[PDB]
Symmetry: C6
Subunit: 102 residues, 6 copies
């Protein structure tokens, strides 16, 4: 169950990134992380090939944000279980309904 | 359309002006204000896609009147996937529903 | 309607002076102090629009005299839409209700 | 009851600024405020003439801090009552023993 | 003595890759994620010192595969003083207990 | 007088090294870790003034050998005024009482 991530500079772009990712494939948006200096990341979980398609769409679609900018992106095909318990990449009760349709 | 419209400014006074202009210019509801550090704050409206287009364009014009204001980014999402409302601050909150209840 | 006026400064001492000068210059209530990171802070006052206009002028002039003070932006909205009060920190709160009455 | 403030870049300078202020005159250190970009402010209250002396000393001492630096300072002699309900400059319970020791001039 | 290894990146996707490479490269425990503002975030692993050296070596190497990745700083303390845990966010916690049990020594 | 020693660094790994080298160098207690944003983080030790002087000097040297650490500022106050502890994060807590006893 891969994890996919798009970090942008600026909030409107991260919202476009989120929207494009879940529309382009069967992935679940599981969170949004702010780390300062305007850098915010959206995080999806799903089958790796779905996640790869999501992230590509997300990256492409930030291009249509006026002032949007992608700072970094990464996919991990098979994240180690320890990561879920420390980093905010885990599903929450709030998004359980979407994890279903994957 | 249940579009979402967003304007991100540098500076708080400009963002208050962007929100005030957007809700005056069309039938949209201001639902959120997000800070992501570094002086960047975004206000978020929801409504019909053509109303949101008008709001965002008005917000951008009106921030021009602000002494020291600046728009950093804007965007409209025409049909926000239902997953977004659960993770990102783009939904009506109880406070805004109080406002809407006055009608 | 009740106008809203705001002065945003780079530095906390300057924002305290801005607030102090605003409430002393005219009949306005200080209702908000907003921090958005990176040293940028804003004080927000509410009152009749002409009082708010006098206050904000006073605030900007007194910041200029703070050792290290700097105003980054200022703005006045004569008739803020009612939706704003439910989302942005511009509203009167119970803690400043006493000063609201002093306005009139 | 005046309010005196020194904003520094960096936290060790702000602690020195606080220490020099309360040692130089009978005022009370009531708080410290962080607003991002490494800017932190310490805040004292007291009689205006005592606060003047505290702030002068805090500014002198911060110059001895390895790497520290004052960014801004300011004293408001007779802060309006409204300020206290919105800005973080209030006395708190925790410092009332020092408030009692302030020297006032009538 | 249980070493502590740290990799600080500018940006969240790189920190997540650093963490993943660290726990895959050796038998250590990822115990924390610290944000200090300005984009700087750190991940912290604990375990035997030769394992922590391999984890930290691998996290640093894997951050290069992150598009837009940057490592800002890295450090390993072989035998961290006992005071450190009670003040700094480097402690083991219940949430990662299952992974501490799997550590190599 | 229980003196107070501080080292502020750029970056979390360097602050952990600063802390570590300080409590290893002399008889002081690590009581505090303060973040003020912009990557600036400060660690705070308490102890006898001559013990604090040695801790701070060691912490500065060891920080400079960290990969990417910088010492942004340091300072030592020999006899901090009583008022400081009720306002700033420099006091002992229960959590490190065990190490105070050891000075
Ligand atoms: Cl209230």
């Amino acid at each position: 169950i891969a994890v996919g991530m798009i970090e942008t500079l600026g909030f409107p772009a991260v919202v476009e990134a989120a929207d494009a990712m879940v529309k382009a494939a069967r992935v679940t948006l599981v969170g949004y992380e702010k780390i300062g200096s305007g850098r915010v990341t959206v995080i999806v979980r799903g089958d790796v090939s779905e996640v790869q398609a999501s992230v590509a769409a997300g990256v492409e679609n930030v291009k249509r944000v006026n002032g949007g900018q992608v700072l970094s992106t990464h996919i991990i095909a098979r994240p180690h279980e320890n990561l879920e318990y420390v980093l905010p990449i885990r599903y929450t009760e709030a998004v359980e309904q979407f994890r279903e349709l994957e």
